[PDB]
Structure 1
């Protein structure tokens, strides 16, 4: 017997440490590795797992040509051992999907899988391996979700979903799902948040989600949610913004609305509230998906004249490609440990990655209440060595 996962507080932490790294592109030089993008990490009672949206092709084969394309019927959510490269011998196929979320409720895995035509997609809800429910696109405009783990509290899982324009007002919802059955949804209040996609969520008593505003916000929207309702919304106050693109530091302190500067498009990213402070992941570049650093901003969660970057860990150099990043948690004794992954995108459309495909590798970090050292953990592939 296993109890449902509980609403624990986040563990104390003061820095992030290298965890798992898959080196998937390097290891894919001989065409063994499945083409992927939009990876994430989620854990059950026994194991942490890598998930990603596969492209139904092996890296460097003719079918991998043109995999920059976001949505095809040949994309599936796949799962593979954390820190391993995805190969035909080690992967599991979870569901057909070109957008997804996964989370473990303490007893079973739930997954949310979107597929189908852009104007008539549906999300399949999978629970314990069985398709238990679905969501039909209601705005008929690329129904889509987190691309990282959802969160479950006392048996009820919450997941954020969007349907509507990429660069104009869209519909944003939170769905509450219990043992695979949709219990209710709420439209996210638009009093503060103006655009929301690709939420990265974690648990700190309540569920906290830090997301992507693809329209007018260079600052990230956020929500605080419990097993019943949305409790609070906003944008991260930090005058040091963390979307890409974004303005140079420092920019506007915008707690209650999108910055309206360098607002579109964006990249999936994450953060962790820590008291009144906030930790924010971001690309090193303000314009491109290169480099990765995590900053701690003093009083960055609140409206304050005192924001300062008290810590910056540079984890992937700006000479290296990054991509999406997202939060995941690991249960400690009586708290959840904050961790994250970084997607390291190689191939199109990255300048000088002269191959026809698009894929990624993964690196991950976890928070501890200790001082970290320093290093650089980029993809590491010599693109000139790769089959094109």
Structure 2
């Protein structure tokens, strides 16, 4: 098997429903593992669901309080795409309360952070063997993407951060080849001010669209190759895509955060398309409910012509959403753009009267065809669930 190449994105004009796991509905009888921060990544044979498990089954007493982000009992797990994660189908990849995974064409790489907040380490797993590690250098929650990394010609690129969420953190990119760290770079801060939870894809180069958790309702981004960071900015679109954010239309800021509705943000994604941009976002401008994707004409560039040419509403605003991220699927000579949406149920969502916090997953892929319309929310009646 050859290493994955720097292919362009395939043509696309809309997104179509792919896999949906209905994990919460299916967990009513306590079979399903509690998770959050799911994502999808594919190898030569299959696409897979990944998520950070909580070391408990949904609805059991050990699931109470799983809103807590970091415990020693969290592992990155893998399970068949669109299935609910159960003890009979999951694989445990590594101990982790923050993770990223990607397939380089030959083998899987994983980046797994765990340990004390002030002294975490990232374990690099390659072909199932622990091959390298990163030591916390700022001693404040060493952490990574919570979605797939990207590999070009054998070199994998992954965003890694350490330092105070809310006090000037060090955002880095690491380059890793066959499980061995080659180099890192500190992300330039000339434009980007805050850069959490990058969602990345390949379109010749690696593009990452991330979360400014402090000052920007518009999303920061970077373009990277197998050698270096090439470009940075914020998405120009006057239609912002973080949560919270101002109502449409807002300000155009290509080089700085909007400086309004800046935090806390939510992990999200987008796809540059020529001078245009596709952006996922919650339907709500204030909370993690609903999900839509918009295409903004000339939204990647400084332009008077920003318009939402397409709006697909995929999860209604009467339903909970959560994180979202990009993944790619190799076509023949291009990469198809896809994404997942985390559908968070439980704490702290209003009226989800249970003690646990978990999610289900829904996914969509891009085609060069016109889409229809529908609604694919979590679908659980929370009143039916063990608390």
Unmatched tracts of structure 2, length 5 or more? none
8 Å Cα contact 1:214/1:264 also seen in 2: yes
Deviations 1:33-72 (A, max 9, x none): 0000000000000000000000000000000000000000
Shift of 1:304: 0.5
8 Å Cα contact 1:148/1:200 also seen in 2: yes
Distance 2:57 2:179 in 1: 32
**Which moves more between the two structures, 290-299 or 160-169?**
160-169
Distance 1:330 1:167 in 2: 35
Distance 1:369 1:167 in 2: 41
TM-score (norm 2): 1.00
Distance 1:215 1:289 in 2: 17
Three-state SS of the structure 1 residue aligned to 2:144 is coil
8 Å Cα contact 1:168/1:215 also seen in 2: no
Distance 1:336 1:296 in 2: 19
Distance 1:15 1:231 in 2: 28
Distance 1:122 1:300 in 2: 38
Three-state SS of the structure 2 residue aligned to 1:63 is helix
Q: Which residue in the other structure is 2:66 paired with?
A: 67
Shift of 1:101: 0.0
Shift of 1:164: 1.1
Shift of 1:167: 1.9
Distance 1:141 1:213 in 2: 17
Distance 1:353 1:175 in 2: 39
Shift of 1:165: 1.6
Matched, 1:140 2:142: no
Which portions of structure 1, spanning 4 or more consecutive aligned residues, are displaced by more than 6 angstroms?
none
8 Å Cα contact 1:167/1:265 also seen in 2: no
Deviations 1:97-137 (A, max 9, x none): 00000000000000000000000000000000000000011
Shift of 1:168: 2.7
Deviations 1:213-238 (A, max 9, x none): 00101110000000000000000000
Distance 2:167 2:281 in 1: 24
Unmatched tracts of structure 1, length 5 or more? none
Deviations 1:190-248 (A, max 9, x none): 00000001000000000000000001011100000000000000000001000001111
Q: Which residue in the other structure is 2:39 paired with?
A: 40
Three-state SS of the structure 1 residue aligned to 2:181 is strand
CA RMSD of the aligned region, Å?
A: 0.4
Q: Which residue in the other structure is 2:282 paired with?
A: 283
Shift of 1:264: 1.1
Task: Show the 5 A alignment for 1:21-170.
Answer: 21-170=20-169
Deviations 1:66-104 (A, max 9, x none): 000000000000000000000000000000000000000
Distance 2:146 2:262 in 1: 21
